[PDB]
Coordinates of C-alpha atoms and ligand atoms in Angstrom, one line a residue:
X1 CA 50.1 19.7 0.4
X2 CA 46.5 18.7 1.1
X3 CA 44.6 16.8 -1.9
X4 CA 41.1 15.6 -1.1
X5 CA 38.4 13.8 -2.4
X6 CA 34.4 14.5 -1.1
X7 CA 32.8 10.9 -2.3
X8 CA 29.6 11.4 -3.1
X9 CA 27.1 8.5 -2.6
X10 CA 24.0 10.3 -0.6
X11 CA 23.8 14.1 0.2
X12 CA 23.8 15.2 -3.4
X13 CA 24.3 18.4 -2.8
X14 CA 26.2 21.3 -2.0
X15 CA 24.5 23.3 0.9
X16 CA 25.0 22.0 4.1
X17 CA 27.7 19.2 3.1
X18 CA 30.4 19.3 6.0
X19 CA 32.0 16.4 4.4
X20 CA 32.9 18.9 1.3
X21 CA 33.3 22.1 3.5
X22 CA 35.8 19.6 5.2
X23 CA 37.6 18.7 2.1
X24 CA 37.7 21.9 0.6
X25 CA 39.5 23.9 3.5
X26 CA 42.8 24.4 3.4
X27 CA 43.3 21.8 0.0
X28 CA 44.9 22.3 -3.5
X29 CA 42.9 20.2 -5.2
X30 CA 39.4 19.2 -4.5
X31 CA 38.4 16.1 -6.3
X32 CA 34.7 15.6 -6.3
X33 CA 33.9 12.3 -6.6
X34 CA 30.5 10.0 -7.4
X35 CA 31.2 5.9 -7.9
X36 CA 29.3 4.1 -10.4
X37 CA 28.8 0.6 -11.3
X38 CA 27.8 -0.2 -15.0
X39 CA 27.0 -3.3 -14.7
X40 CA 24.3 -2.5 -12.0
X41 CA 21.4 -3.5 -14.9
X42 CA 23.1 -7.0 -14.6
X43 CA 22.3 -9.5 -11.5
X44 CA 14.8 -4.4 -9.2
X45 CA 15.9 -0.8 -11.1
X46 CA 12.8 1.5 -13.1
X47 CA 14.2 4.1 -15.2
X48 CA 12.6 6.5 -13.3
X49 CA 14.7 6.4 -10.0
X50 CA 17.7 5.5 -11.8
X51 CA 17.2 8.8 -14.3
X52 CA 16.5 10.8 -10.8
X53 CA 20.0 10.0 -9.8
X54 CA 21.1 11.0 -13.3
X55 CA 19.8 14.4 -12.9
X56 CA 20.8 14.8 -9.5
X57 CA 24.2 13.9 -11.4
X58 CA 23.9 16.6 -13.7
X59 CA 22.9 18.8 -11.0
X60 CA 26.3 18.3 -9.2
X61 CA 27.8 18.8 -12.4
X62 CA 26.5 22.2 -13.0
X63 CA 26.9 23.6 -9.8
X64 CA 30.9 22.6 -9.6
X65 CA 31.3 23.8 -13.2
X66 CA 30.2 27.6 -11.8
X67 CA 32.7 27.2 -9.0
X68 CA 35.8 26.4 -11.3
X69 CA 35.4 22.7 -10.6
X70 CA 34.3 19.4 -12.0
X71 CA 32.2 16.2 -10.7
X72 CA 34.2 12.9 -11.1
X73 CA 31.6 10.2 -12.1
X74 CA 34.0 6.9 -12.2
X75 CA 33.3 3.5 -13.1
X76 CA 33.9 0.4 -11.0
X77 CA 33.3 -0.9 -7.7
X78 CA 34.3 1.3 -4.8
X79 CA 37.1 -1.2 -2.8
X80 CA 38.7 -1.4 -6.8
X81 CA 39.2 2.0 -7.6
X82 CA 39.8 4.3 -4.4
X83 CA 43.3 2.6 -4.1
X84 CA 43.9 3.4 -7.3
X85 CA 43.0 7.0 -7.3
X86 CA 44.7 7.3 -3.9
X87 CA 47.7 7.2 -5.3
X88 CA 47.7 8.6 -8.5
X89 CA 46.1 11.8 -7.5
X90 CA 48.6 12.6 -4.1
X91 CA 45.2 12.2 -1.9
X92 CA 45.6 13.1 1.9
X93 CA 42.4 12.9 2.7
X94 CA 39.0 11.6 2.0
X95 CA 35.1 12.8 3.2
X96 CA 32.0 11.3 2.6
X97 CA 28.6 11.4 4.3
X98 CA 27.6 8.5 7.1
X99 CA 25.5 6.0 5.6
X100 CA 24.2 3.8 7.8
X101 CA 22.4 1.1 5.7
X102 CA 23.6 -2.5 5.6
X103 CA 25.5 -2.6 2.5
X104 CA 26.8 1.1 3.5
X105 CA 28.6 0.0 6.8
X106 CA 30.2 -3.1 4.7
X107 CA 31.0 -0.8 1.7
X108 CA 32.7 1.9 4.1
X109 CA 34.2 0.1 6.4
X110 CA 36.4 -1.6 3.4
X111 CA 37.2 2.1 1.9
X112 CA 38.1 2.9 5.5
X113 CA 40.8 0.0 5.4
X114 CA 42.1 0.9 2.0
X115 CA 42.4 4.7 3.1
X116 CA 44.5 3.6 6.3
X117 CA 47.1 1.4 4.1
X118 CA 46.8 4.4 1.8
X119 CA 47.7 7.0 5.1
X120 CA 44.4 8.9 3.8
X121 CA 42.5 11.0 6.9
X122 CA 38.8 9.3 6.6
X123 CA 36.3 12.3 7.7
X124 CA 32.5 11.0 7.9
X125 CA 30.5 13.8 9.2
X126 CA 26.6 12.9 10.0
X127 CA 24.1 15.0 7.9
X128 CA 21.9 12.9 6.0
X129 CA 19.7 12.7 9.5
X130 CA 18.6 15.3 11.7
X131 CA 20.8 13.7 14.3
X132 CA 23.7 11.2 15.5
X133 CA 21.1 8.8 15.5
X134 CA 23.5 6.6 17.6
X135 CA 23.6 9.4 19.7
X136 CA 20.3 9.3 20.2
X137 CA 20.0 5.7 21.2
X138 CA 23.0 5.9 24.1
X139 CA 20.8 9.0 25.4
X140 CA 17.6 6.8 25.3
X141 CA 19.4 4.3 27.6
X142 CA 21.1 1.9 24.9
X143 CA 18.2 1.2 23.0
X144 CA 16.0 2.8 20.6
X145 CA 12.6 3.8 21.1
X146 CA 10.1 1.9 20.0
X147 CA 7.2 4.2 19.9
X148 CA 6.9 7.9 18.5
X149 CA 5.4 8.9 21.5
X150 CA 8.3 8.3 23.5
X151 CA 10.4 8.6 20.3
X152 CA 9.5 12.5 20.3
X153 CA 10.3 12.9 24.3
X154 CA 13.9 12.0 23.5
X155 CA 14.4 14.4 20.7
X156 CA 12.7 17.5 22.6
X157 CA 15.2 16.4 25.3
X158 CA 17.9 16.0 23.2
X159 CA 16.8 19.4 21.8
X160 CA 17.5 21.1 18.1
X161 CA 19.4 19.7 15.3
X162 CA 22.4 21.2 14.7
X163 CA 21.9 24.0 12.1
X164 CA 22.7 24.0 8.8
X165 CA 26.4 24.0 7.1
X166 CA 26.8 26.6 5.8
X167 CA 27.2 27.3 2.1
X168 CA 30.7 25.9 0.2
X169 CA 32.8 29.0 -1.1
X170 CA 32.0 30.5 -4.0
X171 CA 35.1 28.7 -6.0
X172 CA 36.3 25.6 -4.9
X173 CA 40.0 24.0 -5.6
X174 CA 39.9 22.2 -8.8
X175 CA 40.7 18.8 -9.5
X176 CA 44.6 18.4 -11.1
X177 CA 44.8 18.6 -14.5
X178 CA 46.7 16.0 -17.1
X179 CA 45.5 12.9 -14.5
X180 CA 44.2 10.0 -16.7
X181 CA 41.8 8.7 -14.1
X182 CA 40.1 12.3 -14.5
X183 CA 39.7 12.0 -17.9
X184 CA 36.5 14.2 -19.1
X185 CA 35.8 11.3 -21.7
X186 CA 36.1 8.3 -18.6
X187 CA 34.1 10.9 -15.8
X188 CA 31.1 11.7 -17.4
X189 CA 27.7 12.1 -16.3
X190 CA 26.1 8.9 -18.5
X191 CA 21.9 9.2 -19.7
X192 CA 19.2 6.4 -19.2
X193 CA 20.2 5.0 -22.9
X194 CA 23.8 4.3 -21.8
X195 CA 23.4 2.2 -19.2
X196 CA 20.8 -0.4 -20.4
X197 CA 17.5 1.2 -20.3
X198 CA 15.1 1.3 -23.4
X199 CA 12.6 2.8 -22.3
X200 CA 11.9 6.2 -21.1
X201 CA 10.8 7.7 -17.7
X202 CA 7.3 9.1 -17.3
X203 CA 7.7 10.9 -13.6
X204 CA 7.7 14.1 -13.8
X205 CA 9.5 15.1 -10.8
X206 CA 12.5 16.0 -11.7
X207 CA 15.9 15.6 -9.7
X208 CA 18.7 17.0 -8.8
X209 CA 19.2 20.1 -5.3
X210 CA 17.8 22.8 -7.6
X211 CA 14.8 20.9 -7.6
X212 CA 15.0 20.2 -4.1
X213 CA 15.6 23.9 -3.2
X214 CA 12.8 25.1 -5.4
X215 CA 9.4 22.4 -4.1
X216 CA 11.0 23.4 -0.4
X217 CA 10.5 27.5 -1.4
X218 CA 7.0 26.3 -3.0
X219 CA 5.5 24.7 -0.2
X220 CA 7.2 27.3 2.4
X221 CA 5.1 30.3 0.6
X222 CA 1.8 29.9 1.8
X223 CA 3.4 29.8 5.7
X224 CA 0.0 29.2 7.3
X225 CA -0.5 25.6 5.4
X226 CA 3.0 24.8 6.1
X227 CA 2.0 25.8 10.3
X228 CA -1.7 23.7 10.1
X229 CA -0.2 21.3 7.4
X230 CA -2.1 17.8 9.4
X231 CA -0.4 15.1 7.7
X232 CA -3.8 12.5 8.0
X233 CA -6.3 15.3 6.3
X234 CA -4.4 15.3 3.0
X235 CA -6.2 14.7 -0.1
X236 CA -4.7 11.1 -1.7
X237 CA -6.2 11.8 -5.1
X238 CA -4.5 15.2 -5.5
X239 CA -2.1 14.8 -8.3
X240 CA -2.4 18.4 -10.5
X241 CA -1.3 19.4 -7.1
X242 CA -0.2 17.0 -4.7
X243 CA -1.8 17.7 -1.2
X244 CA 2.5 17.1 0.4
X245 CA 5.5 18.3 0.0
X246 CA 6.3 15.9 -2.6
X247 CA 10.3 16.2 -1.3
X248 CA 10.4 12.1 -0.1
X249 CA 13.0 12.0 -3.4
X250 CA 15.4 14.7 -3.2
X251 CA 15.5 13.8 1.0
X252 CA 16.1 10.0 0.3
X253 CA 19.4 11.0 -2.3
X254 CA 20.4 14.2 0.1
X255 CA 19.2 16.9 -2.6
X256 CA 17.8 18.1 0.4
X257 CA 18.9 18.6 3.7
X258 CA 16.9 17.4 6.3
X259 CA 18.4 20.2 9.1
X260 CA 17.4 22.5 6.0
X261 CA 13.8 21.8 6.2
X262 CA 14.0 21.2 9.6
X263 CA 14.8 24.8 10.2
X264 CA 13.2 26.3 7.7
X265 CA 10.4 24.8 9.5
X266 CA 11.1 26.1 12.8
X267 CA 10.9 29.9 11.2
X268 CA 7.4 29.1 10.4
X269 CA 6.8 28.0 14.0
X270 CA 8.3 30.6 15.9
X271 CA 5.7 33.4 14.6
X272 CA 2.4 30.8 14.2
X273 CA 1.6 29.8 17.8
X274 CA -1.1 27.7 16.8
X275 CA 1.1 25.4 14.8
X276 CA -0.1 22.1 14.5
X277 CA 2.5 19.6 16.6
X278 CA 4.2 16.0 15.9
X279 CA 3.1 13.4 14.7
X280 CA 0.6 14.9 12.3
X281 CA 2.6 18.2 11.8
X282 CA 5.0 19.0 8.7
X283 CA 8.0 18.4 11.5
X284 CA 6.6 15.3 13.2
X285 CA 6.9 13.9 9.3
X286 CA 11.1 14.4 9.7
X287 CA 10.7 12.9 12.3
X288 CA 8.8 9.6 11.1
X289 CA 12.2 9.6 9.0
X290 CA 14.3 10.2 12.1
X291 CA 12.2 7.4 14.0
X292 CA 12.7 4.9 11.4
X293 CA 16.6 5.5 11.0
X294 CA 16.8 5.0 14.4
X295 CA 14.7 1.9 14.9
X296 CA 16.4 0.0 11.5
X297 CA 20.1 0.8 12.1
X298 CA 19.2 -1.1 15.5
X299 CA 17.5 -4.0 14.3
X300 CA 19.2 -6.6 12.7
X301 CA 17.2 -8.1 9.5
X302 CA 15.2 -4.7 9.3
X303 CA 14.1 -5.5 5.9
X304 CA 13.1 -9.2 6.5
X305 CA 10.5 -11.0 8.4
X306 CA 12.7 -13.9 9.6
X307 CA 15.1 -13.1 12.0
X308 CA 13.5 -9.2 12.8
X309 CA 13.1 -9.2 16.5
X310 CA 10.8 -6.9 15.9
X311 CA 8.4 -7.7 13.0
X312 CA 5.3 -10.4 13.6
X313 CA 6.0 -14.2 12.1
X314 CA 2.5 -14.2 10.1
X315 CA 1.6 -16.8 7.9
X316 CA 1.4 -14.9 4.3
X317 CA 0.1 -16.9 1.1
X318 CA 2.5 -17.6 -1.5
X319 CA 0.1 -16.5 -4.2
X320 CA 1.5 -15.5 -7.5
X321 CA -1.5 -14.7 -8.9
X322 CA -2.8 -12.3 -6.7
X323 CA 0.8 -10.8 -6.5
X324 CA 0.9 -10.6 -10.4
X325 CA -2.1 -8.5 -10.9
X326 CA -1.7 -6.7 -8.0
X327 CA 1.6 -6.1 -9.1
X328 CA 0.3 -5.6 -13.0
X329 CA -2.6 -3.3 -11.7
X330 CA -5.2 -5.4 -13.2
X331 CA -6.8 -6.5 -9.9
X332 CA -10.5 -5.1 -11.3
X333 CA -10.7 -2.3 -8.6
X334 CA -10.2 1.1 -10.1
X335 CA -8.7 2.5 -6.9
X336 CA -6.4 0.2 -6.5
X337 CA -5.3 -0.2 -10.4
X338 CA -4.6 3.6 -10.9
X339 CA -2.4 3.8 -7.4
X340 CA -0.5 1.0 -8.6
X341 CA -0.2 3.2 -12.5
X342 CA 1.1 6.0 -10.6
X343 CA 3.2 3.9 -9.0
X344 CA 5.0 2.9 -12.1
X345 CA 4.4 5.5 -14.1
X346 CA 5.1 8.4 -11.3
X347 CA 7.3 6.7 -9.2
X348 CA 5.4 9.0 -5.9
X349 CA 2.1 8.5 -4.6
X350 CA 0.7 10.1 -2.0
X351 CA 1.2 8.5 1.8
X352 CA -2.7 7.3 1.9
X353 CA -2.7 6.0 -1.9
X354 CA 0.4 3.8 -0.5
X355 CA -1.8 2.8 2.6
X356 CA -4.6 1.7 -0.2
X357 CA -2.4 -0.6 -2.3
X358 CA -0.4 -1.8 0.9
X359 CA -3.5 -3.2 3.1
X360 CA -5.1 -4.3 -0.2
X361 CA -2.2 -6.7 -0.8
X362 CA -1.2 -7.7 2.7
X363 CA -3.5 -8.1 5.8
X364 CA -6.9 -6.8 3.8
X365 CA -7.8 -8.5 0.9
X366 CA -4.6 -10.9 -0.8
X367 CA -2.9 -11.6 2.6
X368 CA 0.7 -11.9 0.5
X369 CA 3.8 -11.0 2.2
X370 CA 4.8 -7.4 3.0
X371 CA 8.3 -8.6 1.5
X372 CA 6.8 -9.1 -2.1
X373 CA 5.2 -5.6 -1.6
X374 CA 8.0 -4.2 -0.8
X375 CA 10.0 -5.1 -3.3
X376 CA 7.7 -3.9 -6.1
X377 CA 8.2 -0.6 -4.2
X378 CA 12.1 -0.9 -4.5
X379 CA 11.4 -0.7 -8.1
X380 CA 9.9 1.7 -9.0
X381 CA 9.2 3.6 -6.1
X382 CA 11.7 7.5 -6.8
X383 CA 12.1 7.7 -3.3
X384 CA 12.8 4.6 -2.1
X385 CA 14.3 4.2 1.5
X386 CA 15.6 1.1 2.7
X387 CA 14.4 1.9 6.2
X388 CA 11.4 4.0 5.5
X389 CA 9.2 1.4 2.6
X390 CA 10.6 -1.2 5.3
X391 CA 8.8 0.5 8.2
X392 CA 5.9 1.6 6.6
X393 CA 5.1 -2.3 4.9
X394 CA 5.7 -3.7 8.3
X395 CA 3.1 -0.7 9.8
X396 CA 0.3 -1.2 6.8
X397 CA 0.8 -5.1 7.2
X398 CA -0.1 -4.7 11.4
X399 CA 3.5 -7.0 11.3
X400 CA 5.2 -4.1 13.7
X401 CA 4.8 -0.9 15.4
X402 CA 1.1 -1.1 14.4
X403 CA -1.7 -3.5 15.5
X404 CA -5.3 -2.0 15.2
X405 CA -5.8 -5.0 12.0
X406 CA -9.6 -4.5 12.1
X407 CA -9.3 -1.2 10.6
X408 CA -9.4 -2.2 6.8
X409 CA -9.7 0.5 4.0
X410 CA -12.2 -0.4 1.2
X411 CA -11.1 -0.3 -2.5
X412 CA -14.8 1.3 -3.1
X413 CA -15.6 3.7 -0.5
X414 CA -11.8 5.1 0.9
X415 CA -11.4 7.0 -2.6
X416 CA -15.3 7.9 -2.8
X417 CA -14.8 10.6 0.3
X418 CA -12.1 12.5 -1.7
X419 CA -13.0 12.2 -5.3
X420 CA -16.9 10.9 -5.5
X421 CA -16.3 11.8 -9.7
X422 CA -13.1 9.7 -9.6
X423 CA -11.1 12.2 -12.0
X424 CA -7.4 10.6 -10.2
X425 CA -8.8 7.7 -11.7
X426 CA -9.7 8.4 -14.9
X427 CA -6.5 10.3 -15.2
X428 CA -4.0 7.3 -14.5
X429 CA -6.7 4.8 -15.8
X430 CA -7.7 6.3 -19.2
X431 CA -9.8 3.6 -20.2
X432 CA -12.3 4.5 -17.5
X433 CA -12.7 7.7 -18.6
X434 CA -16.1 7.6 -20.4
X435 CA -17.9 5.7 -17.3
X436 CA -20.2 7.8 -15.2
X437 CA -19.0 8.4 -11.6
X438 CA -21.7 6.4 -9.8
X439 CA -19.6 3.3 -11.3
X440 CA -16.7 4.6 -11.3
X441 CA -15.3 2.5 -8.8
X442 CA -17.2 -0.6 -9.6
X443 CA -17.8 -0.9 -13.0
X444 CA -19.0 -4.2 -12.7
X445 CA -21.9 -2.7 -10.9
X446 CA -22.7 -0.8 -14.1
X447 CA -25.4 -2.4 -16.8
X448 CA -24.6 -3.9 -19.9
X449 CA -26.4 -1.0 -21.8
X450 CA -24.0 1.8 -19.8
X451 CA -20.8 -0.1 -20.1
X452 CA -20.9 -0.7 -23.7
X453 CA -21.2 3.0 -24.2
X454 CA -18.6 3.7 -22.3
X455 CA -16.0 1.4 -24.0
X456 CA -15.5 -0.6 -21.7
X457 CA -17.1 -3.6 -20.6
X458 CA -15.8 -5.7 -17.8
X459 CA -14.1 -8.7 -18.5
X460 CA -12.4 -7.5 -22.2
X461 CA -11.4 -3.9 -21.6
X462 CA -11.0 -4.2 -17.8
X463 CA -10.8 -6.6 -15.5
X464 CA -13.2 -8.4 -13.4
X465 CA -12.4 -7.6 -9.6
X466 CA -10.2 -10.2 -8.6
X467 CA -11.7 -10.8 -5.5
X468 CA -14.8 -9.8 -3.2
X469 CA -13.8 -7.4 -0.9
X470 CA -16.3 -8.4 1.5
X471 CA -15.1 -11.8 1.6
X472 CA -11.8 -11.2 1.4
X473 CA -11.7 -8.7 4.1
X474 CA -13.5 -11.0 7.2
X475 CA -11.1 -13.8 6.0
X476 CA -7.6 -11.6 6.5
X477 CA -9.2 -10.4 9.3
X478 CA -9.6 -13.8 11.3
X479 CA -6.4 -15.2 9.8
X480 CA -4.9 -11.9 11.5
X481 CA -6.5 -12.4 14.6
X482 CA -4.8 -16.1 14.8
X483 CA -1.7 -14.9 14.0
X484 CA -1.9 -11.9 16.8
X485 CA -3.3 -14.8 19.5
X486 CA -0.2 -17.3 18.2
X487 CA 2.2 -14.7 19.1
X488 CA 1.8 -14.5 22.2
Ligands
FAD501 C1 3.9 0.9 1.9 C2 4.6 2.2 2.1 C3 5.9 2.3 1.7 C4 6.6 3.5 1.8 N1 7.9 3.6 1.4 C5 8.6 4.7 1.5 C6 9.9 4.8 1.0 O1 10.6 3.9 0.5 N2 10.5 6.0 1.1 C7 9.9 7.1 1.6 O2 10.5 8.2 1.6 N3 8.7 7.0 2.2 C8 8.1 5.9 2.1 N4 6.8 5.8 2.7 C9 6.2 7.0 3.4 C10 5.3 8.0 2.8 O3 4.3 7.4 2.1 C11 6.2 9.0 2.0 O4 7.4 9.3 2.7 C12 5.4 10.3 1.7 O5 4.2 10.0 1.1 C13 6.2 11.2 0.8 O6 5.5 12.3 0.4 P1 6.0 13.7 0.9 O7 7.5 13.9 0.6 O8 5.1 14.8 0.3 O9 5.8 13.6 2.4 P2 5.4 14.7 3.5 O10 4.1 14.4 4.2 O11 5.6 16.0 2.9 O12 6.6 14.5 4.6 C14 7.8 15.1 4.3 C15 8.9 14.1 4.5 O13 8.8 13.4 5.7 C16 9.1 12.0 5.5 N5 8.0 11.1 5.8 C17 6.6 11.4 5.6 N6 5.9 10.4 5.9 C18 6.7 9.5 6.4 C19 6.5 8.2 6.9 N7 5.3 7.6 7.0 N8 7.6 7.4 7.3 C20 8.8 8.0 7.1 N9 9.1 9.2 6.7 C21 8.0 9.9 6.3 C22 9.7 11.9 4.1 O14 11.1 12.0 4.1 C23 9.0 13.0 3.4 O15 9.8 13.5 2.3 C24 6.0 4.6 2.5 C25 4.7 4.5 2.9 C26 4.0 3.4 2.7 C27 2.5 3.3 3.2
CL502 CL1 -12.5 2.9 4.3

């Protein structure tokens, strides 16, 4: 008889999941299965994306539950419990979605060992990207593009995704009954309380597919912004309603699928002729995600400076204050501040709020390392992507792919052309909120008389700015242009 287990770890969900569609067919028990670690709070981890997960969790849960089935949620590292479970539970086979993200390829490759001792079948379809991105590299030539303008000649060449799986049946086979490593009271979904946290998230994007299924319907029913949707004329201080999809966290824990959207997308296309095209378009931004996948699976010490072929040797300060209030959003520029109390409050901002903060703290105004930036992101950042916040700090910081370092946003004016009242900042930065807009994003500018009456005077209610941006600015610039002459 055939018992399987579909191991969730991306691809949180059930519509187009070949690896369960696989591990369904043709079994007598189905044994749906998430791996947890609870001592993951113990060695970097906001409640916010780890309560995301939860959801998604609870999501899973719910939709096995109305197919006769269960989700599995067991405790342990993975190479310490599979061979357990193998066993006890008859398995013949085992399914999971390929991961191709450092620890991923060491983590699999171990469970692919234990499965063979084990005689378990390993399937490992590819659905988290739009395509076999090693595929794509062997058709490039062996190497991956480094450019999306060549980047999109391959894919247009290579053609379509494959479509989407298609739905799981309507009742699955159940997990066996009576098996003590299935316990309900041992394979529960755990809350943000359980595992360490004390304090409670403030996003307010919720996860989980249903989620995921409901933004994608929301931003597909107005067809003709979806069709002109230009991804650099979004509005950064949107956040009643965010000027993008707002999807980057159910796409980064496969709530969504990306051949989903992708084809959804292509609907739209097909009867708007006018349709804006890649890379501003809706689809050139899935396939920003595609180029990145590609380029970091590739490249060795992706998420590094030393020893990426690929990334710029600059020569960052080692400053902890400036990395400290930049990181504590007290830097004195209300721009800057609120992005960064989104950021830890939201865990989303929008993708030119992100090109604020990141320029501001690497080759603009603080010239600190990309790598401390990015991991401030990896906390608290719902949607964190190892290759994706890699790529983009190594782009904002001109260290790779982009080089143009004389263009330098301003932590006064770039806000000013979208929200000249400032209400993104007085939202996120409520101590602002009585300061009239011509000083809204430098209230040190204000006069004595006008900041006392707003509550708020510079220097005891909010911070001096911890830098002159003019300064600043022509001194990262020059460093920059050393660095860009030094290397060759
Ligand atoms: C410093 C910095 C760090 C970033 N870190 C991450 C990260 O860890 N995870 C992440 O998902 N995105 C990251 N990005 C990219 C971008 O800011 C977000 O993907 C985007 O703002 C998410 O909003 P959205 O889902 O509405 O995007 P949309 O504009 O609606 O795009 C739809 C989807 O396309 C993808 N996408 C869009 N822009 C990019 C991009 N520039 N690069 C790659 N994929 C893209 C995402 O999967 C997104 O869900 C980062 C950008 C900056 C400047
Ligand atoms: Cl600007």
């Amino acid at each position: 008889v055939k018992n399987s287990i579909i191991w969730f770890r991306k691809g949180l969900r059930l519509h187009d999941n070949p690896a369960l569609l696989e591990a369904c067919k043709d079994a007598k028990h189905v044994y749906p299965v998430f791996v947890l670690d609870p001592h993951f709070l113990q060695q970097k981890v906001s409640v916010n994306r780890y309560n995301f997960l939860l959801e998604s969790l609870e999501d899973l849960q719910r939709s096995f539950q109305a197919r006769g089935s269960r989700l599995l949620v067991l405790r342990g590292k993975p190479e310490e419990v599979f061979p357990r479970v193998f066993r006890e539970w008859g398995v013949t086979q085992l399914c999971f979605e390929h991961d191709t993200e450092p620890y991923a390829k060491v983590r699999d490759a171990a469970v692919r060992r234990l499965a063979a001792e084990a005689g378990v079948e390993v399937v490992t379809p590819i659905s988290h990207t739009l395509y076999d991105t090693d595929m794509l590299v062997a058709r490039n030539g062996g190497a991956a593009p480094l450019t999306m303008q060549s980047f999109t000649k391959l894919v247009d060449r290579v053609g379509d995704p494959p479509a989407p799986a298609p739905d799981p049946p309507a009742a699955m086979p159940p997990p066996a009954e009576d098996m003590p490593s299935a316990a309900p009271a041992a394979t529960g979904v755990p809350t943000w309380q359980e595992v360490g946290f004390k304090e409670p998230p403030l996003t307010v994007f919720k996860g989980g597919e249903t989620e995921a299924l409901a933004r994608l319907e929301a931003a597909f029913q107005d067809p003709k912004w979806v069709a002109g949707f230009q991804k650099p004329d979004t509005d950064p201080s949107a956040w009643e309603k965010p000027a993008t999809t707002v999807l980057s966290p159910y796409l980064k824990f496969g709530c969504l699928s990306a051949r989903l959207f992708h084809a959804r997308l292509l609907e739209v296309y097909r009867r708007h002729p006018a349709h804006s095209q890649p890379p501003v378009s809706l689809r050139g931004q899935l396939l920003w995600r595609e180029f990145f996948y590609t380029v970091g699976s590739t490249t060795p010490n992706f998420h590094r400076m030393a020893g990426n072929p690929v990334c710029k040797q600059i020569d960052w300060d080692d400053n902890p204050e400036f990395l400290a209030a930049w990181r504590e959003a007290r830097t004195g520029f209300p721009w800057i501040d609120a992005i960064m109390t989104q950021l830890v409050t939201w865990g989303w901002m929008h993708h030119l709020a992100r090109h604020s903060v990141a320029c501001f703290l690497t080759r603009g105004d603080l010239y600190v390392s990309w790598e401390r930036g990015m991991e401030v992101f990896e906390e608290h950042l719902i949607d964190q992507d190892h290759y994706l916040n890699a790529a983009n700090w190594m782009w904002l910081s001109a260290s790779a792919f982009f080089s143009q370092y004389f263009r330098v946003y301003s932590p006064v004016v770039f806000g000013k052309k979208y929200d000249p009242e400032g209400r993104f900042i007085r939202k996120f930065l409520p101590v602002l909120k009585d300061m009239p807009a011509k000083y809204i994003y430098e209230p040190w500018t204000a006069p004595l008389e006008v900041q006392r009456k707003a509550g708020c005077v510079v220097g005891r209610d909010y911070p001096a700015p911890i830098v002159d941006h003019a300064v600043a600015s022509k001194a990262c610039i020059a460093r920059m242009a050393a660095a860009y002459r030094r290397s060759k």
